């Protein structure tokens, strides 16, 4: 009542695109327990790396790394199908317990972070300062990753659909589509959002027949 | 310099799950133009409805509706493949121009909202008050929709994979999988997050062979 034990900065993990995904928001009073389910970025991925982060930045690299661990034994499956439940649990003592559990296999791996770990009081103040100073740059970074991830899904999906269509897909169409896919994959390797969007657009313009078949 | 023309509340649209997705954040100075690409929720969906919202609530229904319009002519395609670019553009006069463009067909539909539309000064204050009053309830709603949407993807994907596997999928497996899919679909129709998660878990526990084949 006179005081409150609170988390000075956000706590979360690094997700595809190098972005920090928050599990426990800034100024949350502890004890607290939050969870979210994630999945694999690649087909047949056998493990996921849980990189714990403390901070207010959108770029995972600009945040304080609290540590990392892997969860392996993930059985063969298309990307995005596995269910890896990640739980952040801060107890009364202020100790953070992070766990990752594969819902198919039931396997789990944990990392425990002492209450004194993370950033100190001044550093916390600097983090809040920088986050505010770089609010626009972070917004730009967030939309870039949104674009890159959408393009990756398009690339990955389209390729699956082409295979599944086989001879159903006319030669003219498959030629246009595959050129656009190669162009898209090259774009995804860069940092130019407009370029990525341009290649997704080209793909959308030449995939109409494929989409009809896949549908 | 002495003053700044700013957006008092967030502006965005309603996305699947009845959640408000922000395009232009609160306290943004105008003129400003932001965009984001969305897609269809269902296979062969021929149109998307753009419901413009003003407010700070996570539930679209708890926000101020500025209006809505449809973009039709979307060609047959699997759900999540179409690219509908939605742009929010507020000019110097304070007029909001919202557009939706299908990148495949190039078709576009717009709605223009006068600067005097939306919520008035007091209402703005009430909106900020309520958003803060319901920060937890909104968090719960957000995670519920995250869960429901993840389950929907699982349901939809699994069904596609079962078809694509055909005889490759053993009878015992297909029986377990399809029961779990029916159970999952029922859960998705409710508001119980744990129940939805339970059915996704069951599906993850009996789909191992399917996942191997689909992979």
């Amino acid at each position: 009542v006179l005081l409150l034990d609170v988390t000075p900065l956000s706590l979360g993990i690094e997700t595809m695109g190098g972005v920090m995904t928050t599990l426990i928001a800034k100024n949350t009073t502890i004890p607290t327990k939050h969870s979210q389910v994630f999945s694999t970025a690649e087909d047949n991925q056998s493990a996921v790396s849980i990189h714990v982060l403390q901070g207010e930045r959108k770029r995972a690299a600009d945040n304080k790394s609290l540590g990392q661990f892997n969860l392996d034994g993930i059985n063969p499956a298309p990307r995005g199908m596995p269910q890896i439940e990640v739980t952040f649990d801060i107890d009364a003592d202020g100790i953070l317990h992070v766990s990752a559990k594969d819902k198919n296999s039931g396997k789990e791996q944990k990392i425990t972070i002492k209450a004194s770990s993370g950033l100190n009081e001044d550093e916390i103040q600097k983090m809040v300062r920088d986050a505010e100073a770089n609010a626009e740059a972070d917004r730009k970074f967030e939309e870039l990753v949104q674009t890159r991830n959408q393009g990756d899904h398009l690339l990955h999906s389209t390729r699956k659909q082409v295979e599944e269509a086989g001879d159903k897909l006319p030669a003219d169409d498959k030629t246009a589509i595959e050129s656009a896919l190669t162009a898209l994959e090259t774009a995804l390797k860069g940092e130019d959002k407009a370029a990525i969007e341009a290649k997704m657009q080209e793909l959308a313009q030449v995939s109409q027949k494929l989409m009809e078949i896949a549908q | 310099v002495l003053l700044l023309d700013v957006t008092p509340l967030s502006l965005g649209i309603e996305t699947m799950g009845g959640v408000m997705t922000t395009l232009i954040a609160k306290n943004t100075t105008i003129p400003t133009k932001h965009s984001q690409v969305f897609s269809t929720a269902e296979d062969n969906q021929s149109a998307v409805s753009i419901h413009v919202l003003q407010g700070e609530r996570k539930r679209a229904a708890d926000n101020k509706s500025l209006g809505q319009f449809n973009l039709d002519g979307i060609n047959p395609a699997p759900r999540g493949m179409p690219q509908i670019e939605v742009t929010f553009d507020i000019d110097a006069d304070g007029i909001l121009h919202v557009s939706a463009k299908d990148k495949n067909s190039g078709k576009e539909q717009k709605i223009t909202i006068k600067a005097s539309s939306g919520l008035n000064e007091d209402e703005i204050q009430k909106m900020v008050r309520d958003a803060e009053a319901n920060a937890e309830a909104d968090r719960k709603f957000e995670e519920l929709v995250q869960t429901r949407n993840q389950g929907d993807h699982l349901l939809h994907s699994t069904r596609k994979q079962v078809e694509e596997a055909g005889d490759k999928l053993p009878a015992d497996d297909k029986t377990a999988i399809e029961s779990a899919l029916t159970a999952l679909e029922t859960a998705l129709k409710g508001e119980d997050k744990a129940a939805i998660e339970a059915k996704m878990q069951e599906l993850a526990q009996v789909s191992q062979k399917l996942m191997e084949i689909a992979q």
Binding site: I13, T15, M16, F38, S39, A41, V48, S49, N70 | -
Partner: peptide, 7 residues
């Protein structure tokens, strides 16, 4: 639907 890499 958020994905994780393998390092």
């Amino acid at each position: 639907n958020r994905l994780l890499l393998t390092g």
